[PDB]
Amino acid sequence: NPAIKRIGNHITKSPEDKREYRGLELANGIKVLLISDPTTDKSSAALDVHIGSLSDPPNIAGLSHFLQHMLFLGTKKYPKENEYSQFLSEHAGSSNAFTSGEHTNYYFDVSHEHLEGALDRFAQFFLSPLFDESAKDREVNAVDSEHEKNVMNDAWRLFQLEKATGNPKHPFSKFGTGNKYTLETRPNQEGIDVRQELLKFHSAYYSSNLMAVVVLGRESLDDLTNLVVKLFSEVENKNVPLPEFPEHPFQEEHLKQLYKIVPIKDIRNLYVTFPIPDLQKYYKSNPGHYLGHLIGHEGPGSLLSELKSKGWVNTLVGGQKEGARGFMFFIINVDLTEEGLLHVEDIILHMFQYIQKLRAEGPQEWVFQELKDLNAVAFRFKDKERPRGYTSKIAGILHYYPLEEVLTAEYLLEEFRPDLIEMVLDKLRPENVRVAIVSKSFEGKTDRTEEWYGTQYKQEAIPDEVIKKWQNADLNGKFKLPTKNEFIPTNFEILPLEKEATPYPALIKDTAMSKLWFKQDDKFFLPKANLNFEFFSPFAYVDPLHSNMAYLYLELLKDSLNEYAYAAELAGLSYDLQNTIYGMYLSVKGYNDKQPILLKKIIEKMATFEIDEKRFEIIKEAYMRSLNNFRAEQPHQHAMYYLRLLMTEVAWTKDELKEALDDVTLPRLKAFIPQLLSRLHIEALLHGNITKQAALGIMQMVEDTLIEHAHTKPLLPSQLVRYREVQLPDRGWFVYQQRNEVHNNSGIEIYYQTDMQSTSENMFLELFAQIISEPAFNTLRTKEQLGYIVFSGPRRANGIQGLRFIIQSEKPPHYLESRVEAFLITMEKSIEDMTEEAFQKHIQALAIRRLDKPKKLSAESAKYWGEIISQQYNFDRDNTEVAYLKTLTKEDIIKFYKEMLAVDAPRRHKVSVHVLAREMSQAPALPQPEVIQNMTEFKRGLPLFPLVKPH
Numbered sequence: 001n002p003a004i005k006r007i008g009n010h011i012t013k014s015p016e017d018k019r020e021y022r023g024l025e026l027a028n029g030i031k032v033l034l035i036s037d038p039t040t041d042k043s044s045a046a047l048d049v050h051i052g053s054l055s056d057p058p059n060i061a062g063l064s065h066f067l068q069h070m071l072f073l074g075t076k077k078y079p080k081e082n083e084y085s086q087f088l089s090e091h092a093g094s095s096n097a098f099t100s101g102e103h104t105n106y107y108f109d110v111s112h113e114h115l116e117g118a119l120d121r122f123a124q125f126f127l128s129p130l131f132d133e134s135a136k137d138r139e140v141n142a143v144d145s146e147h148e149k150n151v152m153n154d155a156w157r158l159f160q161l162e163k164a165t166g167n168p169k170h171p172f173s174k175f176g177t178g179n180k181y182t183l184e185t186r187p188n189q190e191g192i193d194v195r196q197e198l199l200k201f202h203s204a205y206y207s208s209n210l211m212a213v214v215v216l217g218r219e220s221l222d223d224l225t226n227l228v229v230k231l232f233s234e235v236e237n238k239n240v241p242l243p244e245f246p247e248h249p250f251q252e253e254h255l256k257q258l259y260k261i262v263p264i265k266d267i268r269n270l271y272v273t274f275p276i277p278d279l280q281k282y283y284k285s286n287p288g289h290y291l292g293h294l295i296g297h298e299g300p301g302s303l304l305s306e307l308k309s310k311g312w313v314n315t316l317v318g319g320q321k322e323g324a325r326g327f328m329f330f331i332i333n334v335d336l337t338e339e340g341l342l343h344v345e346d347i348i349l350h351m352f353q354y355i356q357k358l359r360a361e362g363p364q365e366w367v368f369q370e371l372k373d374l375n376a377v378a379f380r381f382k383d384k385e386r387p388r389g390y391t392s393k394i395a396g397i398l399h400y401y402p403l404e405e406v407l408t409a410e411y412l413l414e415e416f417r418p419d420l421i422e423m424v425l426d427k428l429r430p431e432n433v434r435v436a437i438v439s440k441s442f443e444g445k446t447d448r449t450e451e452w453y454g455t456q457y458k459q460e461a462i463p464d465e466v467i468k469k470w471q472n473a474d475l476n477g478k479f480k481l482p483t484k485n486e487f488i489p490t491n492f493e494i495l496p497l498e499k500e501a502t503p504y505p506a507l508i509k510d511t512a513m514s515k516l517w518f519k520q521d522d523k524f525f526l527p528k529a530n531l532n533f534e535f536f537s538p539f540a541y542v543d544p545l546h547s548n549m550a551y552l553y554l555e556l557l558k559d560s561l562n563e564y565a566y567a568a569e570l571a572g573l574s575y576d577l578q579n580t581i582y583g584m585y586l587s588v589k590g591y592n593d594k595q596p597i598l599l600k601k602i603i604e605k606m607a608t609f610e611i612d613e614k615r616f617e618i619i620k621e622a623y624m625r626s627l628n629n630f631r632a633e634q635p636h637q638h639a640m641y642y643l644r645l646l647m648t649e650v651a652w653t654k655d656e657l658k659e660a661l662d663d664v665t666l667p668r669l670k671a672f673i674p675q676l677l678s679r680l681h682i683e684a685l686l687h688g689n690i691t692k693q694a695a696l697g698i699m700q701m702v703e704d705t706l707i708e709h710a711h712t713k714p715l716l717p718s719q720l721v722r723y724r725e726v727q728l729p730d731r732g733w734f735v736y737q738q739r740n741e742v743h744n745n746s747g748i749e750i751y752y753q754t755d756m757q758s759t760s761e762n763m764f765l766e767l768f769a770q771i772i773s774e775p776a777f778n779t780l781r782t783k784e785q786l787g788y789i790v791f792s793g794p795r796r797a798n799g800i801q802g803l804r805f806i807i808q809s810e811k812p813p814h815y816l817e818s819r820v821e822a823f824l825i826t827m828e829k830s831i832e833d834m835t836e837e838a839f840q841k842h843i844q845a846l847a848i849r850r851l852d853k854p855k856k857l858s859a860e861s862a863k864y865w866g867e868i869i870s871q872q873y874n875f876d877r878d879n880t881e882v883a884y885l886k887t888l889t890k891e892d893i894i895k896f897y898k899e900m901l902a903v904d905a906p907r908r909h910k911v912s913v914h915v916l917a918r919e920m921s922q923a924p925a926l927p928q929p930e931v932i933q934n935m936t937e938f939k940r941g942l943p944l945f946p947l948v949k950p951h
C-alpha cells in the first residue's frame with residue numbers, strides 16, 4: 001500500500017502465454033514487472049539502470065563499464081568478493097551484465113527455490129557496493145583485457161571510428177570500454193582517486209527513479225510483490241534528470257564525407273549512413289521499420305537483387321540504427337566484390353535510385369498492413385523465452401513503455417502514418433550522407449590514425465559534382481516494390497495428439513536409404529515444426545578439394561535460393577543448409593503450414609542445380625578470403641581449432657583447403673554434384689505439429705525427389721563410418737605450439753582426456769567440472785587476473801571426453817600452464833576438506849541443470865538431435881545419469897581425480913595447445929613434454945579409440 005505507488009492493470013500478454021504478470025511503480029520511482037510461472041524450473045531477476053558509458057566523466061573513460069564489473073565483487077551485507085558468483089553456482093544459477101550508451105543491465109537465474117537468497121545478494125549491488133581497494137587494482141586488468149581482445153576486431157574498430165569522426169564535443173565520441181590507461185594509469189598521474197569517483201558516480205547516478213526491475217518465479221503475484229518491496233523500496237531516489245542528447249553528433253561539417261579505412265581482415269565493405277531524429281517516440285508507427293523493410297528487402301526487384309546482378313555486392317543490411325535519446329541513424333551497408341570496390345559511386349547511385357522509387361510511389365499501406373499482421377501472428381505464437389534473457393530484455397524496455405504495454409511494445413504496430421514515412425525518407429538525401437569504404441587496398445594510402453584502436457584511415461569531402469549526380473537519381477526500371485508475401489502462414493490448427501504417440505522420438509522408418517525419427521510435439525502446442533536431415537556421403541570430405549566443393553555447392557545453392565527464401569523467412573519459415581565432415585545438413589524450422597512447399601523447393605533445386613559462372617567466381621573469391629581471414633581470429637579460438645585438428649582421425653586444415661581451392665574449376669564442380677548426390681543415406685528427425693503419417697509423407701517426397709532428379713541409390717552399412725578420437729597414452733604429455741600473427745595476446749587449451757563416454761565416466765567428469773567450475777573462474781581470472789577469457793568444463797568429441805581449460809592472456813602459455821596446474825592441487829586440498837553438505841549442494845546444482853526442462857520446441861529438438869548425430873540415441877539420458885549421479889560419493893570423485901587428473905595420476909592423458917602472441921600459491925614440477933612437429937606424424941604415432949556403442 002505504502003511503498004507501492006501504482007499498480008499494473010492488465011499486462012497485455014499473448015493469448016498462448018500461460019505465465020501471469022503484474023506491473024508496479026514503487027514510491028521509490030522504480031518501475032517493476034513480475035512474472036508468475038508456477039511451472040518454471042529456474043527463477044530469475046534483472047535490473048536496468050538508465051545510465052551508461054555515454055555519461056562517463058570526460059577524463060575517466062569507461063567508468064560506468066568499470067563500475068558494472070565492480071558491483072560483482074562484494075557489498076556491505078555480503079562482503080566476501082565471490083559470495084555472489086559462488087551462491088549462484090552452488091544453486092544452479094548464472095549471472096552476467098552489459099553496459100551500453102544509456103543502460104547498465106544486470107541479471108541472473110537460479111533454482112526456483114533459492115530465488116529469495118539470490119535476489120537479496122543482487123539487491124545489495126544497488127544499496128552499498130564495497131569497491132574494495134585491492135579488488136579495484138585487480139579487476140581493472142579484466143577490463144583492460146576485455147579491450148585488448150577487441151583492439152584487433154574489425155567491427156569494434158569501425159564502431160569507435162564512427163564516434164571519432166563526429167563532433168568531438170558530443171558525448172558520442174567517448175571511449176566506452178576503458179582500459180588500464182584510462183581507468184588507472186592516466187588518473188594516478190592526474191591525481192585522481194578512482195575508488196572515490198566510482199563511489200561518487202554510483203551515488204550520483206544509481207538512483208531508483210532511473211531503475212527498472214523484473215522478477216520471475218514460481219511464487220504468486222502477491223508473494224512476489226511483497227518480495228520486491230521488501231528488497232528494493234529501500235533504494236534512494238536522488239531524482240536524477242534523465243540525460244537527453246538533442247544535438248546530433250553529426251552536424252553540417254560531418255556530412256558529405258568519405259572515409260577510406262584499412263581493415264585487419266581481408267574484407268571489403270561499404271557503409272552508408274544518414275543522420276536522423278530520434279524515431280523512438282513514433283514507435284507505434286515505426287516509420288523506420290517500414291523504410292528498413294523495403295530498403296533491406298532481398299526479393300525480386302529489390303536494391304540487393306540488382307546490385308547482386310551487376311555483380312557488385314553479396315549481402316545488404318538496411319534500416320534504423322539506435323544512437324541515444326535525441327538522435328538515431330539510418331544505414332545501408334553492403335559487402336563488396338572486387339568489381340564492386342571499383343564501382344562504389346555507381347552502387348551508391350543505385351541506392352538513391354531505389355530511394356527515389358519510394359518517393360515516387362509514396363507510402364504503401366498494404367505493406368504496412370502486411371507487417372502488422374505478421375507481427376500479430378509472430379506475437380501470438382512466440383516461443384516461451386528463457387527466464388534470464390527475458391527478465392533482462394524486459395527490464396530494459398520498461399524505460400520506454402507504460403507497464404501495460406511492455407510485452408507488446410516491441411512487437412505490435414498500430415497506426416500507418418504515411419506522413420512520418422515521408423518525413424524520414426526526406427532525410428535520406430545525398431547532401432545528408434556519410435560514406436565509408438573498408439579495403440586492404442588502402443594500405444599505406446591513409447594519413448590518419450584513431451587514438452583508441454589505431455585504425456588507419458583517410459577523410460575526404462565528397463566532390464560536389466558527385467553529390468549533384470546522386471541528387472538527380474532517375475528511375476531505374478529494375479527496381480520494383482515487393483509483391484504480396486505468399487508465404488504468410490494461414491493455417492494454425494494444432495492437430496490432435498495421436499493414440500500411438502510417444503514421449504520420445506520413435507524410429508518410424510528404417511530402410512537402407514532412410515532412418516527417420518519422429519515425435520509429435522506434446523509439450524508446447526504451437527503451430528510449428530522442426531525438420532532435420534543429415535545426409536551422408538563419403539565424397540563430402542574425402543579430400544580438401546572435395547570438402548571445398550561441398551561447401552561451394554551449398555553456398556551457391558543458398559545464393560540462388562535466397563530471393564525465394566527471403567519472403568519465407570519473413571513469414572517465420574526458415575532453413576539452414578550447410579556441409580558437414582560426413583555430408584550435408586538441412587533443417588527447416590517454423591510454421592508448419594507451408595513447410596512442405598519450401599522443403600520440396602530446396603530438394604528440387606538441390607538435385608537439379610545449374611551453376612551461374614559469375615556467382616561461382618565471386619563466392620569462390622570470398623571463400624578464399626574467408627579461409628585466409630582465420631589468421632586474424634583470436635588466440636583462444638586458434639588454440640581450440642588446432643586441438644580439434646590434433647584429436648580427430650581425419651580433419652583438413654585451413655591451409656590444405658586454401659591450397660586445394662585454386663583447383664576447383666567450374667566443370668570440376670558441375671561433375672562433383674551428381675557424384676555427391678548419387679549415393680546417400682538420410683537420417684532425419686521430424687519433430688513438431690505433425691502426424692506420424694505426414695512425417696512419412698515428408699520423408700517419401702524427400703527420397704522421391706532425390707531418386708527422381710539425382711538418381712540417388714542407398715549406401716552400404718559399411719560405408720557409414722564415423723571418425724575416431726586419437727588415443728593418448730597413460731602419463732603422456734604433448735604440446736603443439738603455434739603463433740598468432742595478429743593479436744598480441746596468447747591462447748591456450750589444456751585437455752585431460754579421460755575415457756569413452758559411459759553413464760559413469762560421463763558423470764564423474766560432469767561432477768568434478770561442477771565442483772571446480774566456480775573456483776576456476778575465481779582463482780585464475782578474479783584472483784590471479786590472467787585474462788578476461790578463462791574457461792573450464794567438459795570436452796566431448798567423437799564419443800570421447802575429458803577436462804579442458806581455455807585461457808587467453810598477456811602472459812605466455814608455458815606459464816598459464818603451471819598456474820592451471822597450481823589450481824588443481826588447490827582443488828584437491830579443497831575437496832579433501834570440503835564439507836559433506838557442500839558436496840550435495842553441488843550434486844544438486846548439476847541435477848537441476850541437467851533436468852532443466854526445454855522451454856521451446858527447438859531446445860527439445862536440439863536435445864534429441866544431439867542424441868541422433870552422436871549416434872547414442874539415449875533419449876532418457878538426463879533421468880538415468882542424474883539418478884546415477886546422486887549415488888556418487890565424495891571419495892568416488894577423489895579416487896577418479898587421483899587416478900585420471902592429478903599431476904602424477906597413473907592414467908593422465910594431457911595435450912596442450914599453446915598459441916603465442918604476435919611477439920614472443922605454489923605450482924608442482926612438470927615433466928618435459930613431447931613437442932608435436934607434425935600433426936599427421938603425431939596422429940599416426942598413436943592408437944584411435946573405438947566408436948561409442950548405440951544405446
Ligand SMILES: [Zn+2]
Pocket residue numbers: 065069143146
Ligand atoms: Zn566488461
